[PDB]
Design an enzyme around this catalytic site. Structure first.
Site, PDB file in Angstrom:
ATOM      1  N   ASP A   1      -5.006   8.453   0.498  1.00 27.24           N
ATOM      2  CA  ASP A   1      -5.812   7.654   1.399  1.00 27.24           C
ATOM      3  C   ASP A   1      -5.756   8.274   2.802  1.00 27.24           C
ATOM      4  OD1 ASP A   1      -3.218   6.812   2.035  1.00 27.24           O
ATOM      5  OD2 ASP A   1      -3.733   4.658   2.009  1.00 27.24           O
TER       6      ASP A   1
ATOM      7  N   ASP B   1      -0.272   7.198   3.286  1.00 28.34           N
ATOM      8  CA  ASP B   1       0.884   6.524   2.701  1.00 28.34           C
ATOM      9  C   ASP B   1       0.697   6.222   1.213  1.00 28.34           C
ATOM     10  OD1 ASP B   1      -1.026   4.571   3.246  1.00 28.34           O
ATOM     11  OD2 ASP B   1       0.406   3.079   3.947  1.00 28.34           O
TER      12      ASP B   1
ATOM     13  N   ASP C   1      -4.583   7.487   5.884  1.00 25.28           N
ATOM     14  CA  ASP C   1      -3.296   7.535   6.577  1.00 25.28           C
ATOM     15  C   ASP C   1      -2.177   8.062   5.677  1.00 25.28           C
ATOM     16  OD1 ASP C   1      -3.316   5.149   4.953  1.00 25.28           O
ATOM     17  OD2 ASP C   1      -2.084   4.062   6.389  1.00 25.28           O
TER      18      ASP C   1
ATOM     19  N   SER D   1      -7.081   2.156   7.053  1.00 23.57           N
ATOM     20  CA  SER D   1      -7.567   3.385   6.439  1.00 23.57           C
ATOM     21  C   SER D   1      -8.715   3.146   5.462  1.00 23.57           C
ATOM     22  CB  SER D   1      -6.407   4.110   5.768  1.00 23.57           C
ATOM     23  OG  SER D   1      -6.625   5.500   5.807  1.00 23.57           O
TER      24      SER D   1
HETATM   25  O1  X1P Z   1      -6.145   0.757   4.197  1.00 18.77           O
HETATM   26  P1  X1P Z   1      -4.690   1.104   3.944  1.00 18.77           P
HETATM   27  O2  X1P Z   1      -3.812   0.500   5.014  1.00 18.77           O
HETATM   28  O3  X1P Z   1      -4.529   2.629   3.931  1.00 18.77           O
HETATM   29  O4  X1P Z   1      -4.221   0.454   2.502  1.00 18.77           O
HETATM   30  C1  X1P Z   1      -3.824  -0.849   2.475  1.00 18.77           C
HETATM   31  O5  X1P Z   1      -5.003  -1.702   2.131  1.00 18.77           O
HETATM   32  C2  X1P Z   1      -5.596  -1.268   0.849  1.00 18.77           C
HETATM   33  C3  X1P Z   1      -4.548  -1.360  -0.273  1.00 18.77           C
HETATM   34  O6  X1P Z   1      -5.122  -0.870  -1.487  1.00 18.77           O
HETATM   35  C4  X1P Z   1      -3.301  -0.599   0.076  1.00 18.77           C
HETATM   36  O7  X1P Z   1      -2.294  -0.856  -0.935  1.00 18.77           O
HETATM   37  C5  X1P Z   1      -2.764  -1.027   1.400  1.00 18.77           C
HETATM   38  O8  X1P Z   1      -1.597  -0.265   1.748  1.00 18.77           O
HETATM   39 MG    MG Z   2      -2.893   3.748   3.561  1.00 21.54          MG
END
Ligand code: X1P
Ligand code: MG
Ligand code: X1P
Length: 448
Positions: A237, A241, A239, A97
């Site tokens: 964000d 989560d 996705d 994401s």
């Molecule tokens: O890109 P994402 O998969 O949405 O976020 C991940 O990679 C970025 C981190 O800041 C997050 O904690 C982690 O879950």
């Molecule tokens: Mg995420």
């Protein structure tokens, strides 16, 4: 070497040299060999290439005799929830994401949405894919479309007493990710008035890749709160989560403080429970958990460690300062939706604003924010920090890097598991001056 897209917690790479449809198909074949019996749940995010990667995943899975349950465009937490709810053998979410436009990725889970990480199957999958020169088989299993979100929505709504909710005005900012689609399905069942910012899903991301931590992105939500007199704002964000909160003044609330707040919210519904927290910032969570009659459980940061610890402890809730919040009945998994429902209920029932819910805690345990360092020699820099402070004899804990407690102040210093960086967090017992001088002192030492 090895395929660089396979990281510690998930698969992530640039399309199409590090991730493409052939790799995705091979991943599906390899995943089938790594799971117990049952079908596999697949979903995807708003990125333009995500559907095609999911389809290749499906082709590999079905060539290996795995029935596929296609849950469609969704959030990551929906893959977790449906994998567990439907008693599937596992699941994959196609997303990467926060990464740049030319990147995609996959997050993989097994039964009960248990994470598949580097040492728990993911590197086994990588090595199978790496050596797989077989021709693609043809499908021997079926795919069903299962886009019904009723059980998921009902689960989300179970965290609040509808009759106690007030018609709060809430800014919601999906950042053109997928969060708005769930907000809109929830809205007919809630009394809130929503102010929708960057609400439509758009994989071209005309307002930037969703990342509420970037100040320019943060400011869009803050402005919408202030300009509309909203009670609070929520951004996600892509996705969804991860969730990010803004009080009625527009101020972003550091994720640290939501851990204690959400723990108290859950402990009201599930008294005496264990609460899992990470080691970067601790004092406020320990105090608020104990005050609410819960039992705090220290655990290394990182979603797979949090979840395994929650399972072993029958923990009701887990929270990381990095905007990840985990709920026992939600397959022990993280949700970007449950937290704002809980916060809306707290504000509604207490008559206190979100600002007042956190203000005294932020004054009592001020924190630096996470500060990241790319240095020439991480080990020499850490040693330089430790040698400087040795004469004070801190209490040291090695749960996740180095945690050093000096009495009135403490820090955690660790290496990231997703990037080649050092991460620093500092907090003090109600002393903003000590916070700044110690943070700057450590920073200077790391950069030395
Ligand atoms: O890109 P994402 O998969 O949405 O976020 C991940 O990679 C970025 C981190 O800041 C997050 O904690 C982690 O879950
Ligand atoms: Mg995420
Ligand atoms: O790069 P890391 O610090 O190792 O992990 C991050 O990405 C995943 C989250 O679970 C963590 O809390 C977040 O800090």
């Amino acid at each position: 070497m090895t395929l660089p897209a396979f990281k510690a917690y998930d698969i992530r790479g640039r399309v199409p040299d590090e991730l493409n449809e052939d790799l995705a198909r091979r991943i599906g074949v390899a995943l089938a060999a790594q799971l117990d019996q049952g079908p596999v749940v697949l979903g995807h995010d708003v990125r333009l290439a995500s559907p095609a990667l999911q389809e290749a995943l499906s082709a590999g899975l079905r060539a290996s005799g795995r029935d596929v349950i296609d849950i469609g465009l969704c959030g990551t937490e929906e893959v977790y929830f449906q994998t567990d709810y439907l008693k599937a053998a596992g699941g994959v979410m196609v997303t990467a994401s926060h990464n740049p436009m030319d990147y995609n990725g996959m997050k993989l889970v097994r039964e009960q949405a248990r994470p598949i990480s580097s040492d728990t199957g993911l590197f086994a999958i990588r090595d199978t894919v790496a050596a797989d020169t077989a021709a693609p088989g043809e499908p021997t299993a079926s795919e069903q479309s299962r886009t019904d979100k009723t059980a998921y929505l009902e689960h989300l709504l179970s965290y609040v007493d509808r009759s106690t909710l007030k018609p709060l005005k809430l800014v919601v900012n999906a950042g053109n990710g997928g969060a708005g689609l769930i907000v809109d399905l929830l809205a007919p069942h809630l009394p809130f008035e929503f102010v929708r910012v960057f609400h439509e899903p758009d994989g071209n991301f005309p307002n930037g890749i969703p990342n509420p931590l970037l100040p320019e992105n943060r400011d869009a939500t803050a402005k919408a709160v202030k300009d509309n007199g909203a009670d609070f704002g929520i951004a996600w964000d892509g996705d969804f989560d991860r969730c990010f909160f803004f009080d009625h003044t527009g101020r972003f609330i550091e994720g640290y403080y939501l851990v204690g707040l959400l723990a108290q919210a859950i402990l009201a519904k599930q008294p005496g429970g264990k609460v899992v927290h990470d080691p970067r910032l601790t004092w406020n969570t320990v105090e608020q958990v104990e005050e609410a009659g819960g039992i705090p459980v220290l655990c290394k940061s990182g979603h797979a460690f949090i979840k395994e610890k929650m399972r072993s402890e029958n923990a009701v809730y887990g929270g990381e300062m990095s905007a990840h919040h985990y709920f026992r009945e939600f397959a022990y998994a993280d949700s970007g939706m449950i937290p704002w429902l809980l916060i809306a209920e707290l504000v509604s029932q207490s008559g206190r604003s979100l600002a007042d819910l956190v203000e005294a805690r932020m004054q009592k345990f001020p924190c630096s924010g996470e500060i990241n360092f790319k240095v020439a020699d991480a080990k020499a820099s850490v040693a330089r920090v430790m040698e400087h402070y040795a004469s004070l004899s801190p209490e040291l804990d090695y749960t996740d890097g180095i945690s050093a407690d000096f009495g009135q102040w403490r820090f955690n210093l660790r290496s990231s598991n997703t990037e080649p960086l050092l991460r620093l967090n500092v907090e003090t017992r109600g002393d903003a001056a000590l916070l700044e001088t110690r943070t700057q002192e450590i920073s200077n030492l790391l950069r030395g």
